[PDB]
Amino acid sequence: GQLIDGVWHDTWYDTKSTGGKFQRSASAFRNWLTADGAPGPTGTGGFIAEKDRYHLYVSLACPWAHRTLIMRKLKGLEPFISVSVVNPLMLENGWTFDDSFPGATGDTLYQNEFLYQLYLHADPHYSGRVTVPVLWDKKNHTIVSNESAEIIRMFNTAFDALGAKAGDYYPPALQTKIDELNGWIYDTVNNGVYKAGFATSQEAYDEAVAKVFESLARLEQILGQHRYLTGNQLTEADIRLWTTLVRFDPVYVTHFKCDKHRISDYLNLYGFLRDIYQMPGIAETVNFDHIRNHYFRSHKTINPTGIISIGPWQDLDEPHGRDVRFG
Template structure:
C-alpha cells in the first residue's frame, strides 16, 4: 500500500463519516451508556486524542474501548491483540467489517478512532475531530465528578484558532513532509512545520498551556504529535531540523503533559514505532523498527509549574487507568 504522494504534495483525504452521537439523538444515535464502542489503535495520533479525552472525562464505564493492533494491511486495522484475533464485544476481526455493515460500498479510509453502534455492529462515525468535542459536550451527563472542561465556552474561539493552525502545520504537517513525493513538496512542508513549532515555542514560553491556564482540547491535539516526534517523525518522516528534545520550550511542555495523569499513561511507544516503520514500507522498505530513542528522559523534571496554571481547572486528575487498558510498562517511558 503506497503512502508517498505521486502528485508531489500530500493531501489528506478528509471525507469522514459525519454522523454524530448527540444528547438529543438528532442523527439517530443518542448518547446511551453501553451502546457504543470506541475503536482505537494506540499507534495512531488521531485515535490517541480520543483515548486521552475519554480517560480525562472518566467515560470508561459508559463507553467501552476496543484496541486494534499497531499494524494493518490495505484492508484495515485488525484485532490481533485480542483472544482469537476478534474484538470481544463486536466479534469482528477487522474494523472494516463495521464500516461495510453500514456502508457496503464504502470507498474511503477505514480509520481510527471510530465509534461503533454495538447493537447493530455498524460504524457511526470516524470523524476524529468531532468525536473528542462531542465527548466533552454531548456526553457531559456521564462525565466523572471532577472532570475537566476541555472545551470551555469562553475559550472556544481561541481553542478553535489554535487547533486550526496546529492541524494544518503540525498534526498534518509531519505527514505532509513524510509523504511528500517531490523534493519541493517536502521542503515546503518541512519549513512550514518548523516555522509553526517555533511560533508555538514562543507562545508557550510565557504560558503553561495553549489556551488559558488549564489543559484544553488544544493541548490534547498537539501532545499526540509531540509524543511521536522523536521516535518516528524526526527520522521516518525526515522532520530532522531538531528533535523535540532539542527544542527546550516544547520539550518541557510535552514532558509536563506526559507526566500529567491521562496523557503519558496512554502512550505506547512500541505500538507507535511498529506501526509507522512496519506498515509504511514505501518509506521504510526493510520494515526494521529502530530500537531508540531512550525514553527515560520523558520523566525528567520540566519546570513548567513555575508558569502557574491549574492543569484540571476546578476539576481533579483522573484515577489510574482501568486494568485492561494499562499500557505495558515495557512499552512506555521508564525511569
C-alpha cells in the first residue's frame, strides 16, 4: 500500500525506514467535527456540523469503517452524511473505486479511481497508509478525520442540535467502564485475531490464539450477567466488539485459524450478536460478500489460492430473548 509523496508505492512501502515516520503525515487527519466549529482536542476548527457538507468513504469489509456506518444509522445521520463504498478487493492499488461488485458504489463524489486520489487531493505530499473510513469535507475538499474511534464520537454528539436521534453511546456515567473495555478488547481481541491470523511462528500463533479464547470466555460471563457489556444500555464498546464478532465465523474462524469455538457455540455472545444484528437499520450495514471476498482474496500471503471457504453455518435472524431475559 502506502503513499510516499506520493507516489503510491505498490508495495515498496518502502525502501526500509532510513527516513522516516510516515511521517509528518502521521498526524495528518485528526480534526473534529463539532456543534459550533471550534477545534476539538486535536487538529484545527472550521468543521462545524451541518447538512450537505460531510461525506463517508467506507469499505463494507473493514470493521473500523463498519462502526461509522452503524453509528450513522443509530444516530439518524443519513440526512447529513452521504456515503461511498470502495470495492472489497484490495490489491496492489489498495482500496479502489471499481464498481463492478454489487454494493460497491464507485466514488460518488469525484469519480476518482483509487481512494489514494482522495487522499492526494487533500494533500498532494502525503506520506502514510491509505485507509477507510474517511470522513470527507465536501466544502473544503479535504479530510476531516480518518480515525474511526474519533469519527464515532463526532457522530455521537456533533449533530445533536441539528436533529440527530437522541442517543449517547459514550455517556459520562459509563465512560470509564467503556474505556477499560475498549482497551481490553482492542488488545486481546480485535487485534489478537490479527496477530493469530498473520503470525509467522507457532509460538506467536499460539499465544495470540489463546488470548482470543480467554477473552471470549470472559465476555461470555459478562454478557451472561446483563444485556450489553456495561449493563442494559448499548454503548460504543458493544458496537466495537460486535463488528469483530460479526466477522468471526465468516472469516476469522477458518481464515485466521481462530478455530477452537465458533461464536454460535457461546449462548450469550451469539445472542448479543443477533440482538444487535436485529436492531432496525443495522442488518443492512452488513454485507457478507464484501467481508468474505475482501479477507479471503486480499491476503495472498495467508491464503495463496484465494479460495473462499464455504463458511460456518448460521442464521442471525433467529429470535434471542435478550430483551426479556434480563434483567
